[PDB]
Amino acid sequence: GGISEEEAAQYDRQIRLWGLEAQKRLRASRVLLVGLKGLGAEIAKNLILAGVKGLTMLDHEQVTPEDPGAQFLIRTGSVGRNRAEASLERAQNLNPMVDVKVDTEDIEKKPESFFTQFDAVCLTCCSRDVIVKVDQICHKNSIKFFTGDVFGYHGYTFANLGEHEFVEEKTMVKKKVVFCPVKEALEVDWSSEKAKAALKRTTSDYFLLQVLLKFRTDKGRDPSSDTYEEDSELLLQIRNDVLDSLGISPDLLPEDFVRYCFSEMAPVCAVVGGILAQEIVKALSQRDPPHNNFFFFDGMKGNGIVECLGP
Amino acid sequence: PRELAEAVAGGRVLVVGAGGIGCELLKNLVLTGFSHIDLIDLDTIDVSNLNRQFLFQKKHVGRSKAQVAKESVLQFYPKANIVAYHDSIMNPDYNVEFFRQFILVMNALDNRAARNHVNRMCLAADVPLIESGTAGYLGQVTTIKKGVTECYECHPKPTFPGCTIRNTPSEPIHCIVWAKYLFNQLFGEEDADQEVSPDRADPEAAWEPTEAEATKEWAKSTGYDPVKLFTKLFKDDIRYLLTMDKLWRKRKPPVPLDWAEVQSQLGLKDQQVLDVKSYARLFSKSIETLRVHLAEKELIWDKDDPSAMDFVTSAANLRMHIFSMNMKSRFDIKSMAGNIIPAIATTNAVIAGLIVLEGLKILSGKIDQCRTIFLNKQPNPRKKLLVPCALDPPNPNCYVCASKPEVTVRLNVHKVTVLTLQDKIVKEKFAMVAPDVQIEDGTILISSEEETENNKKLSEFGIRNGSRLQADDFLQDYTLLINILHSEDLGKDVEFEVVG
Amino acid sequence: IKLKVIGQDSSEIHFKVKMTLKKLKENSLRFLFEGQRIADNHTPKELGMEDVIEVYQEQTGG
Ligand SMILES: *NS(=O)(=O)OC[C@H]1C[C@@H](Nc2ncncc2C(=O)c2cc([C@](C)(O)c3cccc(Br)n3)cs2)[C@H](O)[C@@H]1O
Ligand SMILES: [Zn+2]
């Protein structure tokens, strides 16, 4: 059709799932991914295999000694190399049909015009301040915005697809779903009787995220298992302050949560990266209802929950 | 944590399958710190694999999946210890002692028969098994542990009448199945259940209620001549069919096709539906190729052999035409004939991540916290996209994992051969791989070592409504007692039945 | 009670049964109510059923 014979042969098993028109939409789409750590590498791998037009992998950090000894896009012994540069050869090789590019400059320093070339932006390991900034830029220019992160056994994804139209098989029917800004999503008011009732059925993973975002804001990094005792102590204090601040019992997040939220566990990257990449695919292809607006994963319980928070 | 890390760096694990789930799972195990892995897969890499089997690139097409998966992993982690087997897990080299090597087995299979075998091996060896599967956007994981959980076969698991295929097709699938049957009749193992000629004894045909109540040779003798086959199949047979006047009182008669008459009549290429002439030409072309191939190497039908696939496409579309149905694209027919499961990277990635999380809980001595986890496409009413459920205890009535299991089978002991018992019943229905059947009477009936060949009606051995058989699979370390009932009111198409 | 069975593919059915479950579920499916597996001899009364039953098939690809 509008794809070559080689592409039809390669993409055969997914064209049989989502159709040739959806595959053609992916083929036209360019994605920015920020952060090439465990979760970012999974997302990159899934998007590149799916056959997007292009993926720009942006990371300004070096591979460090504390980074895992095994990383599937990075050769062992790359301590000190820029992480996106270190990821480029293996990532490109997953799918030569995709234009895979590297950017080594800090996302914070990027002008608003840098974003306009992309159909979707996906942020991993970024600060709350950065998430809000880029979501605002994406809303201006109608760009699909995603963020996600993993912490120990837990992980999350968030989407802001603005006013999002798609088709779904009942024959296709066209539907619309409306998302809110990430600032609203992260700053829910738990005062009203309505909110107080919502809270009963809200996963505590949403407060976990608030605690971990504030750690990242306060420390400039995430909790690390090398500084477990030091980081555990501060996380407990942040739990107290964050929850007290929202008028919620600190005990909604159990006291031993610190045992389960450290480091990047590869299977958690795979789950969270699989869910996030597939939402990107759905959003780009405008096929099937996207999760509105948070997915929370707890790998101890095997729970994966979709919460609509913000409005 | 120390104990768990030591278990993981210590012991040895087995991954059965190096495909969509298997490649993801191999990666996750290595990055999680599993320092000794064995990986088995019997297949070679195909271009259709490359949208989701990310350890394989185009240059690897035609090499062993398992061997390439290992090579690819060693490029990002040289210290991994991986053993790759280019082999089937069904091979008797993989005996109970082989399985006992492992602290954990993980399935990454795409069919039930192999999963049944692995279930039995893990029960025999008393090694925990993580079972999993995917299809499209959906999938699931679960843990199997002898004496603690249901086994893979504790619950019953989820078919065309001969006469609807041979005489009265009304759906494209009937025509597709007919063409597969035709391919096997012409070039494959001649099976009696795959007859393609009109059925001369069909209840709907018979006028009185007393009677209603009750191919390769020929193609060989023509040199596999396309035109002669076309006429026999698309002309001669249809006219014969039109004999059976009762059939066509109700429904649209089929319309026979004549070779010379036919000869003088967007999405992907393969998604186009061609005209009758083109399929008739494809049919001819494909036969001439297949006959040539049947001289170098009976053939086995494979959706990925262009000629075999073209044969089935053309034959089914001509038959569709004859019975006044719209013809179908090669792309559609490939799905249906090949039973292709649509598949993508993300579903397999999620399932593989869950496999390892379940594995960690097992090896951490926390099996009480293991779950069956379903992956949904959309959240359930409790907002759950991944739905965990507690593990169930062994089913006391399971025909596999119970103490001394027994089943009951109703057949006709006078018309059922000893080959049908080995193949349709003990091998296929009950999933034994290397079986040994003998009568319960103080009389070896089937032997593992191929002996016997019997392959004689059953009643000619001292077998009647009440006899009992002792089927062993020593490889599977599994014994099943089969109780026979006899009957003659089974059905035109039901040759045996497992009594429930 | 009117009950809703909902399958993975979003197939929504309105059933209608009496509160005193093998007949409702009418063997390639497993049936759940808010987390818990539905036995053949389960009753709505026994389960606190007013609602929605979820159905799950085992996939065999990989
Ligand atoms: N889901 S996927 O298709 O992406 O990947 C699945 C993976 C499973 C693997 N199959 C396999 N691997 C190891 N051992 C056995 C198997 C089998 O599935 C089977 C082998 C047989 C027998 C009886 O050995 C057989 C039957 C018919 C032909 C042949 Br040759 N052998 C039965 S089932 C697939 O290759 C794939 O990579
Ligand atoms: Zn069992």
Contact assessment for residue A283 and residue A161, using Cβ atoms and an 8 Å cutoff:
yes
* Burial zone of A110 (CB within 10 Å; 0-12 exposed, 13-18 middle, 19+ buried): middle
Residue at a domain's end among B353, B387, B403? B403
Please give the helix or strand (H or E) that residue A21 lies within, else none. Answer: helix A20-27
Asked if residues B176 and B169 have their Cβ atoms less than 8 Å apart, the reply is no
Q: Are residues B189 and B224 in the same domain?
A: yes
In chain A the first and final C-alpha atoms are separated, in Å, by 42
Distance CA B173, CA B181 (A): 12
The answer to whether residues B112 and B69 belong to one domain is yes
3-class DSSP string for chain B = CHHHHHHHHHCCEEEECCCHHHHHHHHHHHHHCCCEEEEEECCECCHHHHHCCCCCCHHHCCCEHHHHHHHHHHHHCCCCEEEEEECCCCCCCCCHHHHHCCCEEEECCCCHHHHHHHHHHHHHHCCCEEEEEEECCEEEEEEECCCCCCCCCCCCCCCCCHHHHHCCCCCHHHHHHHHHHHHHHHHCCCCHHHCCCCCCCCCCCCCCHHHHHCCHHHHHCCCCCHHHHHHHHHHHHHHHHHHCCCHHHHCCCCCCCCHHHHHCCCCCHHHCCCCHHHHHHHHHHHHHHHHHHHHHCCCCCCCCCHHHHHHHHHHHHHHHHHCCCCCCCHHHHHHHHHCCCCCCHHHHHHHHHHHHHHHHHHHCCCHHHCEEEEECCCCCCCCEEEEEEECCCCCCCCCCCCCCCEEEEEECCCCCEHHHHHHHHHHCCCCCCCEECEECCCCECCCCCCCCCCCCEHHHHCCCCCCEEEEEECCCCEEEEEEEEECCCCCCCCCEEECC
Out of B30, B54, B268, the one facing A1 most closely (by C-beta) is B268
A40 within 8 A of A34, measured Cβ to Cβ: yes
The residue among A227, A305, A269 whose CA lies nearest residue A70 is A269
Q: Which residues contact A88 (CB under 8 A, 6 or more apart)?
A: A57, A100, A102
Question: Mutating which of B376, B383, B386, B392 best tests the C interface, going by the most C Cβ atoms within 10 A?
Answer: B376
Strand partners, A39: none
Q: How far is CA A175 from the centre of its chain?
A: 24
β-pair partners for C6 = C12, C54
Q: What is the distance between the alpha carbons of residues A222 and B14, in angstroms, rounded to a whole number?
A: 34
Same domain, B387 and B411: no
Q: Which residues of C touch B382 (CB under 8 A)?
A: 34-35
Query: Residue C27: which of B110, B112, B156 has the nearest Cβ?
Result: B156
Q: Bridge-partner residues for A298, per DSSP?
A: A154, A303
Does the distance separating the beta carbons of B353 and A76 come in below 8 Å?
Answer: no
B311 CA to middle of ligand 1, Å? Answer: 25
First to last CA, chain B: 49
* Beta strand residue intervals within C1-62, DSSP E: 2-6, 12-16, 30-33, 36-37, 52-56
Picking from C59, C57, C44, the residue whose alpha carbon sits closest to that of residue C4 is C44
Elucidation method: X-ray
Do B165 and B280 share a domain, yes or no?
Answer: yes
Please indicate whether, in this complex, the C-beta atoms of C60 and B111 are within 8 angstroms of each other. Answer: yes
Residue B240's CB: how many other CB atoms inside 10 A?
14
Query: Separation of B15 CA from ligand 2 center, angstroms?
Result: 22
- Cβ-based interface (< 8 Å): residues of B facing C: 17, 19-22, 107-112, 115, 132-135, 138-140, 155-158, 341, 343, 348, 374, 376-378, 380-382, 387, 389, 392
Is the alpha carbon torsion for B271, B274, B280, B282 positive or negative?
Answer: negative
Q: Which chains touch B (3 or more CB pairs under 8 A)?
A: A, C
As a whole number of Å, the end-to-end CA separation of chain C is: 39
Residue A33 in tokens: 């991914």
Are residue B182 and residue B315 in the same domain, yes or no?
yes
Helices B172-187 and B276-296, packing angle to 10 deg? 30
**Mode of pairing for the β-strands spanning A120-124 and A163-169:** unpaired
Whole-number Å distance between alpha carbons of A248 and A199: 9
Q: Residue A157: which of A22, A9, A290 has the closest Cα?
A: A290
User: Min CA distance, B195 vs chain A (Å)?
Assistant: 31
Distance of alpha carbon B50 from alpha carbon A13, whole angstroms: 9
| Helix, strand, or coil (residue A61) | coil
Q: B69: Cβ below 6 Å to ligand 1? A: no
Which is nearest to A183 in space by CA: A211, A160, A206?
Answer: A160
Q: Are strands C12-16 and B104-107 parallel, antiparallel or unpaired?
A: unpaired
Residues of B annotated as part of the active site: 163
Q: What residues in C contact B380, CB-CB < 8 Å?
A: 6, 54
Q: What is the dihedral of CA B342, B347, B348, B351, to 10 degrees?
A: -140
Rounded CA separation A222/A265 (Å): 14
Q: Which two tokens stand for residue B477?
A: 């370390």
Residue A199 C-beta-side C-alpha neighbours within 13 Å? 17
SS3 call for C32? strand
Residue ranges making up the domain that contains B379: 1-157+343-403
Examine the domain organization and report whether B100 and B17 are in the same domain.
yes
- Examine the domain organization and report whether B264 and B357 are in the same domain: no
Q: For residues C46 and B3, give the distance between their C-alpha atoms in angstroms, rounded to a whole number.
A: 43
Contact A43, A57 (CB under 8 A): no
Distances (CA, A) of A191 to A140, A180, A202, A244: 30, 20, 14, 13
CA B83 – ligand 1 centroid, Å: 18
Q: Which helix (H) or strand (E) holds A135?
A: helix A128-140
Residue B231, number of CB atoms within 10 A of its CB: 17
Among all residues of chain B, which has the CA nearest to that of C32? B389
Name the residue ranges covered by the structural domains of chain A. 1-311
Residue stretches of the annotated binding site of B for ATP: 17-22, 41, 49-52, 65, 88-89, 110-115
Q: Do B141 and B166 share a domain, yes or no?
A: no
Q: Does B16 share its domain with B96?
A: yes
From the list C51, C58, C62, the residue facing B20 with the nearest CB is: C62
Q: Give the helix, strand, coil percentages of chain C, each rounded to 5.
A: 5, 35, 60
Task: Go through A72-89 and write b for each residue having 16 or more CB atoms within 10 A of its CB, e for each that does not.
Answer: bbbbeebeeebbbbbbbe
Per DSSP, A71 falls in state B
Residue list, CB under 5 A from ion ligand 2: B 151, 154, 398, 400-401
Residue in B90, B300, B301, B348 to alter for ligand 1 test, most ligand atoms within 8 A of Cβ? B90
- Residue A13: its chain B contacts at CB < 8 A? 48, 51-52, 340-344
Which ligand has the minimum distance to the alpha carbon of residue B394?
2
Minimal-distance CA residue of chain A relative to B304? A9
B143 shares a domain with B38: yes
C-beta separation of B82 from B90 below 8 A: no
Widest CA span of chain C, in angstroms?
Answer: 41
Task: Confirm or reject contact between C52 and chain B (CB < 8 A).
Answer: yes
Domain locations in chain C?
1-62
Whose tokens are 């002692």? That residue is: B97
Note the resolution in Å, 1 decimal: 2.0
- Is any ligand 1 atom within 6 A of the Cβ of residue B45? no
Burial bucket for residue A251 (CB in 10 Å: 0-12, 13-18, 19+): exposed
Residue of B24, B335, B371 lying closest to A270 (CB–CB): B24
- Measured in Å, residue C55 CA sits from the centre of ligand 2 at 22
Tokens of B379: 């959240």
Separation between Cα atoms, residue B330 and residue B313, nearest integer Å: 6
Nearest CA to ligand 1 atom 20: B88
Helix axes B2-10, B345-363, angle to 10 degrees: 110
| Domain spanning C1-62, CATH architecture | Roll (3.10)
How many structural domains is chain B composed of?
3
| Cβ–Cβ under 8 Å, residues C31 and C41 | no
Q: Is ligand 1 within 6 A of the CB of residue B39?
A: no
